[PDB]
Scaffold this active site. Structure first.
Site: not given
Ligand SMILES: [Cl-]
Ligand SMILES: [Cl-]
Length: 162
Positions: A11, A20, A117
């Site tokens: 980040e 962002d 997943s």
């Protein structure tokens, strides 16, 4: 390596409001302020979170403070989630950290949509999970990060971060 260093790597740190990768206003270590297009709305959410009048700038310490809280909230979100908890509880420490990074990035909401997943992780079919996770908008939009996290699940080691 640990979750904190791992996310600080993914980040970055910025002490001024920034957009962002999706164009939302953010500050510190990936702390999302708001999904509104309004800068004002963001500066207001920022002041409320810090408890002072920041004027869109915070100190390193303040950043680190938001970051601790945000890591905490991620872990607690996983623990509170009926679909996630048993997955998380089934894994080793390194792989749990990979799961926290995802939830930190995409929210519980986003993560909880990797059902298939998740079931593969729970079974410890690592390579298969790795392939299935790559079939996602997540991988397509932030491929380098996604690969780093996907390798972490695949191997159970921190190699992608060294
Ligand atoms: Cl907050
Ligand atoms: Cl990326």
């Amino acid at each position: 390596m640990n979750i904190f260093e791992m996310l600080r790597i993914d980040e970055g740190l910025r002490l001024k409001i920034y957009k962002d990768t999706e164009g939302y206003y953010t500050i510190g270590i990936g702390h999302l302020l708001t999904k509104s297009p309004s800068l004002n709305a963001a500066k207001s959410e920022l002041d409320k979170a810090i408890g002072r009048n920041t004027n869109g700038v915070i100190t390193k310490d303040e950043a680190e403070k938001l970051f601790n809280q945000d890591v905490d909230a991620a872990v607690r979100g996983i623990l509170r989630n009926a679909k996630m908890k048993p997955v998380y509880d089934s894994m080793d420490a390194v792989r749990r950290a990979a799961m926290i990074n995802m939830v930190f990035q995409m929210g519980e909401t986003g993560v909880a949509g990797f059902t298939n997943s998740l079931r593969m992780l729970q079974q410890k079919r690592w390579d298969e999970a790795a392939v299935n996770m790559a079939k996602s908008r997540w991988y397509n939009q932030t491929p380098n990060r996604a690969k780093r996290v996907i390798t972490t699940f695949r191997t159970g080691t921190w190699d992608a971060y060294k």
